[PDB]
Design an enzyme around this catalytic site. Structure first.
Site, short mmCIF file in Angstrom:
data_model
loop_
_atom_site.label_atom_id
_atom_site.label_comp_id
_atom_site.label_asym_id
_atom_site.label_seq_id
_atom_site.Cartn_x
_atom_site.Cartn_y
_atom_site.Cartn_z
N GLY A 90 -0.71 7.02 1.57
CA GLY A 90 -0.25 8.38 1.82
C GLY A 90 -1.02 9.12 2.88
CB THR A 103 7.59 -3.58 12.14
OG1 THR A 103 7.09 -4.59 11.22
CG2 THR A 103 8.58 -4.40 12.97
CG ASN A 114 -0.41 0.55 2.47
OD1 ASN A 114 -0.40 1.79 2.66
ND2 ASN A 114 0.20 -0.31 3.28
N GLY A 148 1.80 -8.48 5.51
CA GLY A 148 1.41 -9.88 5.43
C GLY A 148 2.58 -10.84 5.59
CB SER A 153 15.51 4.77 9.32
OG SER A 153 14.92 4.33 8.11
C1 LIG Z 1 -3.80 -1.13 3.68
C2 LIG Z 1 -2.90 -0.81 4.88
C3 LIG Z 1 -2.93 0.49 5.40
C4 LIG Z 1 -2.14 0.85 6.54
N1 LIG Z 1 -2.23 2.12 7.07
C5 LIG Z 1 -1.53 2.35 8.25
C6 LIG Z 1 -1.70 3.63 8.92
O1 LIG Z 1 -2.52 4.51 8.57
N2 LIG Z 1 -0.91 3.77 10.05
C7 LIG Z 1 -0.06 2.88 10.53
O2 LIG Z 1 0.62 3.09 11.58
N3 LIG Z 1 0.09 1.66 9.98
C8 LIG Z 1 -0.65 1.45 8.88
N4 LIG Z 1 -0.52 0.20 8.25
C9 LIG Z 1 0.40 -0.81 8.81
C10 LIG Z 1 -0.28 -1.83 9.73
O3 LIG Z 1 -0.76 -1.20 10.92
C11 LIG Z 1 0.65 -2.93 10.17
O4 LIG Z 1 1.75 -2.28 10.90
C12 LIG Z 1 1.30 -3.73 9.02
O5 LIG Z 1 0.37 -3.83 7.90
C13 LIG Z 1 1.78 -5.10 9.40
O6 LIG Z 1 0.68 -5.93 9.90
P1 LIG Z 1 -0.07 -7.00 8.93
O7 LIG Z 1 1.03 -7.77 8.21
O8 LIG Z 1 -0.90 -7.83 9.91
O9 LIG Z 1 -0.95 -6.19 7.97
C14 LIG Z 1 -1.33 -0.15 7.14
C15 LIG Z 1 -1.30 -1.42 6.57
C16 LIG Z 1 -2.09 -1.77 5.45
C17 LIG Z 1 -2.07 -3.20 4.94
O1 LIG Z 2 0.20 4.95 3.34
C1 LIG Z 2 -0.35 5.00 4.47
O2 LIG Z 2 -1.24 5.73 4.81
C2 LIG Z 2 0.29 4.08 5.45
C3 LIG Z 2 0.70 2.81 5.03
C4 LIG Z 2 1.42 1.97 5.79
O3 LIG Z 2 1.76 0.84 5.42
N1 LIG Z 2 1.84 2.40 7.02
C5 LIG Z 2 1.48 3.65 7.43
O4 LIG Z 2 1.97 4.02 8.61
N2 LIG Z 2 0.70 4.49 6.67
#
Ligand SMILES: Cc1cc2nc3c(=O)[nH]c(=O)nc-3n(C[C@H](O)[C@H](O)[C@H](O)COP(=O)(O)O)c2cc1C
Ligand SMILES: O=C(O)c1cc(=O)[nH]c(=O)[nH]1
Ligand SMILES: Cc1cc(Nc2cc(F)c(C(F)(F)F)c(F)c2)n2nc(C(F)(F)F)nc2n1
Ligand code: NA
Ligand code: NA
EC number: 1.3.5.2
Length: 353
Positions: free
Chosen positions: A115, A241, A112, A264, A182
Site C-alpha cells: 500500500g 510490468t 504483496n 515472480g 486501467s
Molecule cells: C515486495 C514488492 C514490492 C513492490 N513495490 C513496488 C513499488 O513501490 N512500486 C512499483 O512501481 N513497483 C513495485 N513492485 C513491483 C516491481 O517493481 C516489479 O514491477 C514486479 O515485482 C515484477 O518484477 P519481479 O517479478 O522481478 O519481482 C513491488 C514488487 C514487490 C515484489
Molecule cells: O503495494 C505497494 O506498495 C506496491 C506493490 C506492487 O506490487 N506494486 C506497486 O506499484 N506498489
C-alpha cells in the site's frame, strides 16, 4: 556464491523470518555494504545507450526493493546496471497493516499489498542530496538512477501528487516513473501532460526522462490508448510490468488467495507478452524497461527480444540472493553470443523482425 545462497542461506532466512522482516534485513545489509562486492566485471556487450544515458549493463533493481532510497550504493555494488527507488509518495504514509507480504515458494512467487508505505518526498530528497554528486559521477560512469513516484492514499488530486514528485525528486533523478492503472484516455492524457510540463520546467542538468509503468492486467483497449497517448505526448519510455492482480491457474502456494500483486515466475510470460504488444503498438519507437519474473539470462533475453531495452528484477533476489544479478548477466552474455548478437542493443526487438 550461487548454490550456497540458493541452497542454504536464502532457505534458512525463509524459515526464520517473515518476508517483510527478511526484506528489511536485506535493506540494512545492502546499505551497510556488508555484502561482498560483485565479482562479475561487465563486458562491452552488455552496455546499452537509451533514455539519454549509458547503462553499463541492462539489469536493474525494480521499484519496491529500495522504497525510500536507503540502499542505492549497495545496490550498485551488487552489480545492478541501474537502480530504481520508490515508490515515493508526497507525504509520509504507513501503508497497509502487517502482514502485507507473502511468499509462494512453490511458485517462485510473492504476493504483496504494501500500500505504498513511504517515508515521503522530503525524507527521500534529503537522502538523495547527501550523495547527489556521487550519483552524478555514477550516472556518467554508466550507472543511472530512477525514481518511481506514487500518490498518497487520501489525495484528492492524483496529478498534483505526481507533479510534486517531479518537482522534488526530478532534479535528483535520471528518470522518473509514474504508475498507471486501467479502470479514461483523456484523463491519462491530462495527467501525463501535467507531469511533462513540470519536468520541462526543471533546469536542463536536472531534467529527467519520464516513463509510465503499467500493469499486466490491462485490456487490449487500454493498451491501445496508452500507446496512443505515450506517442502523442512524447513520453520517454514504458516500464512493463508491475505485479498482477490475476491468479494464473496452477499456483500452488497456500497463500495464493491473499489480496495483492503477484510477482515472480507466474508473472514472467504475461509480462513478456505485454512488452511484445507495447513494442508493436509503439512501432519500436518507445524504449521499454522489461520487468516481471526474470531469474535467468533466458528470461532477460526473451524480454529484450520482445522489445525491452533494459530489464529489472526484484522477486528473484528474494529467492536466490545477490548472486542472481551476476547469474543473469553472465547467462545473458552467453546467450547473446550463441544467438549471434553483437550486444544487447542488437537483440532489442529482434523477435519483431
Ligand atoms: C515486495 C514488492 C514490492 C513492490 N513495490 C513496488 C513499488 O513501490 N512500486 C512499483 O512501481 N513497483 C513495485 N513492485 C513491483 C516491481 O517493481 C516489479 O514491477 C514486479 O515485482 C515484477 O518484477 P519481479 O517479478 O522481478 O519481482 C513491488 C514488487 C514487490 C515484489
Ligand atoms: O503495494 C505497494 O506498495 C506496491 C506493490 C506492487 O506490487 N506494486 C506497486 O506499484 N506498489
Ligand atoms: C528469505 C527472504 C529474503 C528476502 N530478501 C532478501 C534479499 C537479499 F538479497 C538478502 C541479502 F542480500 F542480504 F542476503 C536478504 F537477507 C534477504 N525477502 N524479501 C521478501 C519480500 F518481502 F520482499 F518479499 N521476502 C524475502 N524472503
Ligand atoms: Na547535480
Ligand atoms: Na547539481
Amino acid at each position: 556464491d550461487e548454490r550456497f545462497y540458493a541452497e542454504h542461506l536464502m532457505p534458512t532466512l525463509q524459515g526464520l523470518l517473515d518476508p517483510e522482516s527478511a526484506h528489511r534485513l536485506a535493506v540494512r545489509f545492502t546499505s551497510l555494504g556488508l555484502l561482498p562486492r560483485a565479482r562479475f566485471q561487465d563486458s562491452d556487450m552488455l552496455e546499452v545507450r537509451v533514455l539519454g544515458h549509458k547503462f553499463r549493463n541492462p539489469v536493474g533493481i525494480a521499484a519496491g526493493f529500495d522504497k525510500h532510497g536507503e540502499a542505492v550504493d549497495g545496490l550498485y555494488k551488487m552489480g545492478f546496471g541501474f537502480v530504481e527507488i520508490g515508490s515515493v509518495t508526497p507525504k509520509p504514509q504507513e501503508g497497509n497493516p502487517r502482514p502485507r507480504v507473502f511468499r509462494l515458494p512453490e511458485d517462485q512467487a510473492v504476493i504483496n499489498r504494501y500500500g505504498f508505505n513511504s517515508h515521503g518526498l522530503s525524507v527521500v530528497e534529503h537522502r538523495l542530496r547527501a550523495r547527489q554528486q556521487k550519483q552524478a559521477k555514477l550516472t556518467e560512469d554508466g550507472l543511472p538512477l530512477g525514481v518511481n513516484l506514487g500518490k498518497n492514499k487520501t489525495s484528492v488530486d492524483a496529478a498534483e501528487d505526481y507533479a510534486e514528485g517531479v518537482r522534488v525528486l526530478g532534479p535528483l533523478a535520471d528518470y522518473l516513473v509514474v504508475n498507471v492503472s486501467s479502470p479514461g484516455k483523456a484523463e491519462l492524457r491530462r495527467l501525463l501532460t501535467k507531469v511533462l510540463q513540470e519536468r520541462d520546467g526543471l533546469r536542463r542538468v536536472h531534467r529527467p526522462a519520464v516513463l509510465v509503468k503499467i500493469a499486466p492486467d490491462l485490456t487490449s483497449q487500454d493498451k491501445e490508448d496508452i500507446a496512443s497517448v505515450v506517442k502523442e505526448l512524447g513520453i520517454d519510455g514504458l516500464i512493463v510490468t508491475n505485479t498482477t492482480v490475476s491468479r494464473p491457474a496452477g499456483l500452488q502456494g497456500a497463500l495464493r488467495s491473499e489480496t495483492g500483486g503477484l510477482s515472480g515466475k507466474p508473472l514472467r510470460d504475461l509480462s513478456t507478452q505485454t512488452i511484445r504488444e507495447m513494442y508493436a503498438l509503439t512501432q519500436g519507437r518507445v524504449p521499454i524497461i522489461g520487468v516481471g519474473g526474470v531469474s535467468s539470462g533466458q528470461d532477460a533475453l526473451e524480454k529484450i527480444r520482445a522489445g525491452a531495452s533494459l530489464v529489472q528484477l526484484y522477486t528473484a533476489l528474494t529467492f536466490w540472493g545477490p548472486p542472481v544479478v551476476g547469474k543473469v548477466k553472465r547467462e545473458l552474455e552467453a546467450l547473446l553470443k550463441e544467438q549471434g548478437f553483437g550486444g544487447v542493443t542488437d537483440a532489442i526487438g529482434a523477435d519483431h523482425r
